[PDB]
């Protein structure tokens, strides 16, 4: 994906205000609650059979934070997302066989977590910029499929 | 398929939103037009500038239709039949556009409801909007 | 949402297929395992070689469940409740796998039915398989 | 997408037996009947309000043939689908705004038309090879989105 300087600024201005681990814990938690088949990939974490269990699980919190730190690193490499995410693409595609639609769903959960915690800053224009970058990260993660 | 718990989550949340529904749906439409500009093609006939009177008016129509759906959770196809005719037969709307709108509605609710937009309420609302979309894109009568 | 014409297309075609249903579903499973090899992960416990007795047996189970659905087109959620428990709650099957199977079932029917697999019959069957998938991937009871 | 020599042979062996215009007319016809929103792109063709009308329409037949000749050309360029389909990607994405899922649906209609007319040859292995090439063509047509 190509992002304009305006879009990149809308993204990075908000990102400087974001608690990356808290966004990550919420986004991954919401993924598992809203799209329950995604739990199949994370059985080792413990009981994921209720929203209550998912949202209190320590591994969901720590893994969510790890995912969002990885996303943050991506934001430093907006002109080379495919290269940045190549090793993770090999992992998620060749080893884990995650269907790429699920990458887009997790991106949408990050968007929802941002709206929840930063409503005044998460304007329609700023959302639009984030939709482009979450789509870009999903496309990069899916590259080994193509 | 919505569970009775999903139906209760939808009814309770919609009721809490109450008279803000039209305002929230207008915001959802503006979020859709902004984040997913290809959706504007269906609305060439109105002013789609952010904050426009035309978007406020359309947001009221859409909110009132969602109210009809919330009141008929056991039989959406009967309740939304005329609207399926509009969206499937007359306008031929690609289903991806509903995915775009539904996501933008959830983003709007997350922004306004905060902590009250729980993961469980979010899941029930996602199922509800998806069910409405399936009906509006079906040709059945 | 299926129209009454869709329901008639499904009933008439399923009836014509008759006792070949199990054989055709086994072929559909083999087409799925071959074209979409990631689906094999769910079937690690059986012999999935083409023509295997295990695939024949599973094809019979799936065909008989599709027969239950054809007999309950007005209320699939009630009729398929136990199978939703299996596929949504117990096995956590990603919905993409249903897209893969449904397509492979339609390919199988196109191969065996030829000209009798009309565009109209194809459309009704696509809607029917999609409706079944929506139910089997829902958590409602 | 990468195709093995075995897969390419399964594809091209069957293709030598195929009536390209007839497959094309059937595939596009089935797209319009099965996924009716796709009719929005082809209003100029005439009445598309029934299966009967769609399947008798001369423009659906001629356009279907054109689509399948384009697909045939692609089969000559399996190591460079992105380049081969670049101009058509610009058209379908930047000018027509066709959602890429629809490219995959049309690929699946070509698969169904092949099964209908060549059942003995359309074995599970040969289908598998075709699924890879229709996915590849869809990805190439969608490239301007990424
Ligand atoms: C924004 C999209 C995503 C990003 C940035 C991301 C990032 C990561 C990272 C950084 C790791 C750790 C790699 C390592 O241990 O070396 C990981 C592992 C993993 N990811 Fe993702 N991921 C994404 C989406 C997904 C999705 C959608 C799923 C499945 C639904 C998934 C399933 C997994 C699994 C199962 C692991 C291994 C976990 C373990 O057992 O330790 N990922 N991912
Ligand atoms: C939550 C899902 C939706 C609901 C409940 C809904 C509801 C409605 C209602 C109540 C009307 C007015 C019908 C009339 O005046 O007779 C309408 C019209 C219309 N809808 Fe939707 N709609 C939905 C999604 C969409 C989407 C996703 C699109 C396209 C992106 C769309 C495009 C249109 C258009 C073009 C009209 C007619 C233009 C106009 O009324 O001025 N709708 N819809
Ligand atoms: C047309 C849609 C489907 C129908 C009607 C269906 C039906 C069934 C039935 C009747 C059973 C046996 C349940 C029992 O013995 O109590 C079953 C089991 C199972 N299904 Fe499905 N199924 C469908 C789609 C799928 C898909 C797409 C997958 C994964 C790719 C899948 C994976 C499984 C597994 C792993 C089992 C248990 C293993 C076994 O029975 O040996 N099913 N299904
Ligand atoms: C296998 C995938 C596809 C291929 C190979 C393909 C190929 C083509 C070709 C060769 C043309 C003619 C270009 C020209 O006139 O210079 C064309 C035009 C067009 N395509 Fe596609 N196409 C595909 C999928 C689709 C889909 C899925 C849609 C919409 C649902 C679509 C909509 C159109 C439209 C509206 C035109 C212009 C028709 C006219 O008004 O003359 N195409 N395509």
Residue numbers in the entry:
A (entry chain B), D (entry chain B): 1 to 146
B (entry chain A), C (entry chain A): 1 to 141
Paper text:
In vertebrate erythrocytes hemoglobins are usually present as tetramers (α2β2) of two α-chains and two β-chains, each chain with a molecular mass of ∼15 kDa. The structure of guinea pig hemoglobin is a typical vertebrate hemoglobin tetramer made up from two α-subunits and two β-subunits of 141 and 146 amino acids, respectively.
The crystal structure of guinea pig hemoglobin at 1.8 Å resolution suggests that the increased oxygen affinity of guinea pig hemoglobin can be explained by two factors, namely a decreased stability of the T-state and an increased stability of the R2-state. Absorption spectroscopy of dissolved crystals indicated that guinea pig hemoglobin crystallized as met-hemoglobin. Superposition of guinea pig hemoglobin with human hemoglobin in T-, R- or R2-state revealed that guinea pig hemoglobin crystallized in the R2-state. The R2-state of human hemoglobin features the same special C-terminal conformation of the α-subunit as observed in guinea pig hemoglobin. In contrast the β1/β2-interface of human hemoglobin in the R2-state is devoid of intersubunit salt bridges, while in guinea pig hemoglobin two intersubunit salt bridges are present. Firstly, the salt bridge stabilizing the switch region in human hemoglobin is not present due to two amino acid exchanges (Glu30Thr30 and His50Pro50) in the α1-subunit of guinea pig hemoglobin.
